[PDB]
Amino acid sequence: HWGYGKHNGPEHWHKDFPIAKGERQSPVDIDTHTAKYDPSLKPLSVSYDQATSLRILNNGHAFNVEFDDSQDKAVLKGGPLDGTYRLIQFHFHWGSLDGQGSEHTVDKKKYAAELHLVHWNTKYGDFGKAVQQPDGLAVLGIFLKVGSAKPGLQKVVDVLDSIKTKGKSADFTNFDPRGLLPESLDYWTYPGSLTTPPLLECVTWIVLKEPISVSSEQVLKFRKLNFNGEGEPEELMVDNWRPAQPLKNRQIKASFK
Ligand SMILES: Clc1ccc(Cc2nnn[n-]2)cc1
Ligand SMILES: [Zn+2]
Numbered sequence: 001h002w003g004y005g006k007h008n009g010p011e012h013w014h015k016d017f018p019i020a021k022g023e024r025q026s027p028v029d030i031d032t033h034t035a036k037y038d039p040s041l042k043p044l045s046v047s048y049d050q051a052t053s054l055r056i057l058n059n060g061h062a063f064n065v066e067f068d069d070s071q072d073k074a075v076l077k078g079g080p081l082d083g084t085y086r087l088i089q090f091h092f093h094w095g096s097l098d099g100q101g102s103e104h105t106v107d108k109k110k111y112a113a114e115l116h117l118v119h120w121n122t123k124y125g126d127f128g129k130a131v132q133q134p135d136g137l138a139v140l141g142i143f144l145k146v147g148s149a150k151p152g153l154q155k156v157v158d159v160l161d162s163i164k165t166k167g168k169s170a171d172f173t174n175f176d177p178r179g180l181l182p183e184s185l186d187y188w189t190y191p192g193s194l195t196t197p198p199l200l201e202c203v204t205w206i207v208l209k210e211p212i213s214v215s216s217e218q219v220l221k222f223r224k225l226n227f228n229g230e231g232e233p234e235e236l237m238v239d240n241w242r243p244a245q246p247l248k249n250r251q252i253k254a255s256f257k
Contacts, residue, residue: 002197003061003227005235010242017197024201025245026192027103027114027141030252035188038253044079044185044206046140046178051087053175056159060166060227061196062091062240065156065175069120069127074177076119076138079255080189080204085119085138088127090177092116093195094222096238098146101219103195103241104207106143111211112219113144114241115180134191136202142182147213152179157221166229182210186256195242209256 002008002016014020051074057064066089067074074087094113095101102111117140120130130136155175162170186209193201225237 004240013197013199017199019193019199019201022193022199022201023248024191024193024250025199026195026203026205027105027242027244028190028192028247028250028252029105029108029244030188030207032107032254035252035254037257038255041080041189041253041255042078044187044255045077046181046185047077048074048087048176048178050074051177053172053177055169056156056163056172057169058163058166058225058237060229062093062237063156063160063163063222063225064089064091065172065177067177072122076117076140076206079187079206080253081138082135084122086122087117087119087177090115090117090180092144092222093241094144094219094238095241096223096236098216098219100239101241102143103244104141104143104205105244111143112146113214113222115142115144115212116140117142117177117180131194131200131202133202135204137194138204138206141205141207142180143208143211144214144219145211146216146219149215149218150180150212152176153214153218157218160221160225164224164230165226165232168230180212182208182212184208184210186210186254188252188254190250190252192250
C-alpha cells in the first residue's frame with residue numbers, strides 16, 4: 001500500500017523497505033560542476049530498431065509501456081555498461097505542475113517529468129534475477145521540459161484515457177521508443193537504486209543531459225490519470241516522483257567535457 005501521499009509516501013517507505021536509507025539510493029541531485037568527465041566511458045549504444053512494444057498499463061504508480069524482452073530486440077550497451085541490457089519497459093514520473101516531476105534533479109533544477117527506459121542485464125537471464133544484482137538493471141533517464149510538442153510521445157498521450165485507472169491496460173504494439181530520445185546521447189552515470197519500493201540497489205543510472213521538449217498539453221494528459229482503480233474516488237496521478245536522496249560515497253561521472 002505504498003504510494004506518494006502524505007501518509008504512504010516516500011518519507012514512510014523506510015518502514016517497510018529499510019534499504020530506503022541505504023548507501024546507493026536514487027534519485028540524486030546531479031551537481032554538474034562536481035560530476036567528473038570520465039575519458040574511459042565507452043560510447044553509449046542504444047539499439048532499439050528491433051523493439052517490439054506490446055501493451056500499456058496503468059499499475060497505480062505510473063503508466064508502463066511494456067516490450068517483448070524474450071530476445072535481444074531492443075538493447076542498451078556500452079557507456080558504463082558491461083554486456084548487454086535488454087529493454088523491458090518504460091514509464092514516466094511527473095508533477096502536478098510544470099516546475100516539478102522529475103526524480104533526478106540537475107543542480108537542483110526539477111524538470112516537469114522524467115522518462116525511465118528500464119533494461120536488465122541479460123547475463124542474469126531474467127528480470128527478477130537481475131534486480132538481485134548490483135549491476136542488474138540499467139535505467140536510461142531522460143528529462144522532460146515543457147515547450148514544443150514531442151511528436152513521438154503523442155501516441156502515448158493519445159491512448160491514456162483508455163487506461164485512466166489502476167489495472168487498466170491497452171494494446172500498444174508498433175510503438176517506436178526512438179522517438180522519445182533527444183538528439184544527444186551525452187549522459188551522467190552513477191550507481192543507484194530503484195526509485196520505488198522495493199528500492200533495490202541494482203541500477204546503473206544513465207541520465208541524459210539533453211532534455212526532450214514536450215508540450216503543456218502533452219504533460220497535462222499525464223496528470224488526468226488516476227492512482228485509484230475504477231469506481232473509486234479520484235486521486236489524480238500526479239507527483240509520482242521520489243525526491244533526491246543523499247549521494248553518500250558515490251561519484252557521478254559525465255560522458256562529455
Ligand atoms: Cl520494471 C520497473 C522498474 C523500475 C520502476 C520504478 C523505478 N525505479 N527506478 N526508476 N523507476 C518501475 C518499473
Ligand atoms: Zn522510474
